[PDB]
Amino acid sequence: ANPCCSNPCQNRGECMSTGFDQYKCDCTRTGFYGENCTTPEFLTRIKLLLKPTPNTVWYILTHFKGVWNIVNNIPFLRSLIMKYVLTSRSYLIDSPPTYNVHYGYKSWEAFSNLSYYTRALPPVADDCPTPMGVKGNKELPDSKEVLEKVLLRREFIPDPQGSNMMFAFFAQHFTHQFFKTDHKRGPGFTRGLGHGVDLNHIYGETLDRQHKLRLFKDGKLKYQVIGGEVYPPTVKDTQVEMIYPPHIPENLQFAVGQEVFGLVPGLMMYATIWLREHNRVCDILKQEHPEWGDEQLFQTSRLILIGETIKIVIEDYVQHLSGYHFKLKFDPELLFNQQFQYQNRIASEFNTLYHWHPLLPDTFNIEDQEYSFKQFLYNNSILLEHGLTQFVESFTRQIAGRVAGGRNVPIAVQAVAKASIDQSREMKYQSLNEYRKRFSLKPYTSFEELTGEKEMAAELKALYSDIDVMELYPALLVEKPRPDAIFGETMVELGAPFSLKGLMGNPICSPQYWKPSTFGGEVGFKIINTASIQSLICNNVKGCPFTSFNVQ
Amino acid sequence: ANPCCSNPCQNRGECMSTGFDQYKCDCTRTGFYGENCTTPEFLTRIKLLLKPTPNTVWYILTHFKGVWNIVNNIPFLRSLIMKYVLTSRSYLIDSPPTYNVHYGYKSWEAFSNLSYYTRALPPVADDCPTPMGVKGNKELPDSKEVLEKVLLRREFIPDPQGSNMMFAFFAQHFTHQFFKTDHKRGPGFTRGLGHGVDLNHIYGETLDRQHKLRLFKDGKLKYQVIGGEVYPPTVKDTQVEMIYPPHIPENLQFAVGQEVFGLVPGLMMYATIWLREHNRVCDILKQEHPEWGDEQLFQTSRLILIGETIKIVIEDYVQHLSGYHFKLKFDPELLFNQQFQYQNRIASEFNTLYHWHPLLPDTFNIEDQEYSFKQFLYNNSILLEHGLTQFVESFTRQIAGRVAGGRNVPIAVQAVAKASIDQSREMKYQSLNEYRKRFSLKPYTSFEELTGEKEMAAELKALYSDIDVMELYPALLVEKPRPDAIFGETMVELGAPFSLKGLMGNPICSPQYWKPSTFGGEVGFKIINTASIQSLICNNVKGCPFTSFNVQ
């Protein structure tokens, strides 16, 4: 019924109904005009020829390594390029946010209600004839069939980029502070009202939860010592609610910021490391400020660990998966002379892109042991058995699975991979090509172009019939990977804008926050600016084991 | 004890303790250096000579009326000047926000907790020897003595700018959507979690309250017809909670967005006007969009009334009290090529500046009646008796009191004016001169310089002894007024940055929102851009009575 169901407006134009069977496109500041905003203005036509393809920019950044060696050592030039990286990506994000799962039009409810994930593209109207709008059949192909044919893992396909389990669990740990779906309300809702990197997975979402976790001495968080090693406190000691099976002994019920981090020892490993990092920073700040109280020591340490997290994510984590030879740089000053909104709203699609199920291995290999999913889940006894040192060394060695390329989703999490499909449909997501156009990508003309091969493409064509009906999430996992890369084009070109906007949109990156006094002086400021995944492990894990996000 | 108690850092430098009796100033991006950030850099020294005094800029804007007549009709030039107005003011505001009543240092608690008013200046630390830091005596002068000597009204002093009661009640009505002190928590807390112009005083703060107020037909709000006139619904009919004395008849207990607007008929008058405006806009939008449902009609009308509100505040309301001959302009496009944060956090100080107690008259003169405070309070029967038309005509005629100049606080509200003083001390406000310096003003060197006279100045000197101890709030009401103006310099130079930042910081002023489709097309967009305090009254009040923010 809705005349906008066909998504007629192009180039980020906005569609509005002007009757029961008529519409109008708002071409304001899109650079285009005409009925569907497809006729480019003069300046627009120029940029279309100048601006390079994303597979060209990716090529430049991931090749000419000898040239980048020169550029990386020229601070002026390095800053110039990183500046362009930050600005060009964040331009794709609406800020302040617009739509959510319940509003395909702008409204104060959509803006003000922080319980929603926001949406980069509006939901398909409920009164639309087809799930994608007007194209396709009355119902999308069976999600179980999509899963089994092109998603489920036959043989384990390792990541050619060499991403290890330190990378895998970091991603899971890091993103679970702003991906906290409120399953009581629905998949389009979140419990992470900070909508960013606030480290609530360490300190707790609520003030009540934070105080139960705090020692209230020297700004530190509560902890316990087991075998001479520092571990998180227990549920019994702090009364913070955690998610554990009833058969789990209460001395193994560790209490941390995020309630689900008891799920896997890999998450509990990072929770422990970050816990130690907080208290380490407390000691350092106390050395500098003996006149400071517990409260200021805590708050300043939290701001410092936020800085470290963003530092590490940009210069280690993102640096790895991007495959760039350009040396990425966390420098908030790069945006001080730029137009930039220091705010963020977590997008539903960003959460969907981050469903990296194929990343998981078939077994979790710690030391000489090889644990199954059943043995690994909710089993912190494994962590106490081997220790953090053995955990880091083992996870540094074990490679992770390739995400793009198809058929690499471990069958142990098939219900989870199917939920992504189902829930994406439940949230009325628009098609793959709609999202590609939204982020300046050309639509795929065939399933073969999408997969880069023949077999899976044929399988998908039997299911979806039309390429313009192809869903976003399963397309990410079967997409033709970039040359020896872990991802396809869609994953990176869509995800980077959400990521960098979330990282740089943090208030500590703003000019009034980004100064030594915010972090207790130059000493605390230096902790942020010299942070790395290696130094994080070195300072907090016994023996200072070598670590990295790739296998050696 | 705290080495920062003397507020040693100048030019918005930040003070940090480096020991029990030592400090360090963070001079980052202040334009100054040295121990106290008092030594100007070269570029800074230039601007100091170039940049004009606020009492000179005010002079230019409020004089040379013949010249402004030419400028106002040159769209390029008018836009250029309004641009500078918006940018130069908003630069004084920290955005994202920093301090609150409980944090004199930056912290994630201070940033993330929206229940706090933010603070333009940090509170004086609790372990400071004197209430202002180090200067003055152990305790500030008795607030009752300050009140009775230089604040309380002897003879009614009318506003020379001709501000009427339409202005007074507009101010009270308008500001009570973001000044909603949570008295359960303390004076530094707020219930207005939107921290801006969201019109929650019309639509309710919570979703539960909004749905009780809505008709769920044609996007409209519930209403009742009394004597052929449209008035708000009752508490009994809608079950929304309002604040009323137990003796108030339930047919007179009107239910509106703000729970306190039953307090005075002046507020209920505006609540009724805006209620009618929402339903009027619903009719217009329904005419254009018969295919729209109740929800979209409601949401779009709300965004439109938000636009009208900002439009009226800038071009009628602010236009009046500013005294400018320059024609102010609400144009979000003026900031599209500028650096600006589309966000806002309501400052405690802005609330304190807005305690315009001297504005109130001695009686509320409606038609041929003259009501006392006792008769006027909680008496909506007055509103039904005379009607909206008579209210508008009467309030347009009745002049309001001068705010600056001293001794004009009506004794009927002395308990409220005393509370303003006491709560300011409770929230540990810094001195008047500290806040003047914060907003680029020179400190007052004497009480005579502050008041511009002799008698009140002597009174204050006996109470405060030192000018550097003089409090902010009572200083506003006794300050030497600008020539034939309602305010002194401090009130305007401090308030204008808070005001304009809140208005333009609204998400509908952002480039992604500021387009016709957001407001249902050009017809709705036109409503915002042609809104005025007169058109608001003309469209919604029978007879289209003349109205204005000044007496005729």
Ligand SMILES: *[C@@H]1O[C@H](CO)[C@@H](O[C@@H]2O[C@H](CO)[C@@H](O)[C@H](O)[C@H]2NC(C)=O)[C@H](O)[C@H]1NC(C)=O
């Ligand atoms: C914002 O800060 C206020 C003040 O600290 C918090 O209110 C306190 O909440 C605790 C519960 O954890 C109560 O025991 C205190 O009595 C409250 N104090 C006051 C003054 O009300 C509030 O919880 C914080 N809000 C958020 C969202 O964290």
Ligand SMILES: *[C@@H]1O[C@H](CO)[C@@H](O[C@@H]2O[C@H](CO)[C@@H](O)[C@H](O)[C@H]2NC(C)=O)[C@H](O)[C@H]1NC(C)=O
């Ligand atoms: C944000 O939106 C959600 C969804 O509309 C609101 O949750 C609803 O709240 C009402 C109460 O007013 C309940 O009757 C519904 O069952 C809730 N729905 C869901 C899906 O949870 C929520 O209240 C909104 N948040 C705010 C702060 O207004």
Ligand SMILES: Cc1ccc(Nc2c(F)cccc2Cl)c(CC(=O)O)c1
């Ligand atoms: C779904 C997704 C997409 C891209 C990235 N990172 C990334 C990338 F893979 C290439 C260039 C820049 C960035 Cl920020 C990430 C990881 C991250 O930035 O948090 C996730």
Ligand SMILES: Cc1ccc(Nc2c(F)cccc2Cl)c(CC(=O)O)c1
């Ligand atoms: C305490 C206070 C100070 C200044 C103003 N308005 C105002 C003014 F009085 C002069 C110049 C610009 C502006 Cl925005 C106002 C009114 C307002 O904008 O809400 C209140």
Ligand SMILES: *[C@@H]1O[C@H](CO)[C@@H](O)[C@H](O)[C@H]1NC(C)=O
């Ligand atoms: C705009 O799009 C509609 C539907 O997508 C199409 O039928 C029409 O031809 C288009 N108009 C143009 C391209 O001018």
Ligand SMILES: *[C@@H]1O[C@H](CO)[C@@H](O)[C@H](O)[C@H]1NC(C)=O
């Ligand atoms: C948990 O891990 C330990 C190894 O430390 C193993 O012995 C035990 O069987 C595991 N528990 C389950 C339920 O698999």
Ligand SMILES: *[C@@H]1O[C@H](CO)[C@@H](O)[C@H](O)[C@H]1NC(C)=O
């Ligand atoms: C800085 O301020 C302190 C206290 O206000 C003062 O004692 C000191 O002399 C100042 N230092 C300067 C102005 O260099």
Ligand SMILES: *[C@@H]1O[C@H](CO)[C@@H](O)[C@H](O)[C@H]1NC(C)=O
């Ligand atoms: C309320 O106003 C009416 C006039 O409409 C007046 O007669 C009455 O006395 C007032 N009520 C009180 C309690 O003063």
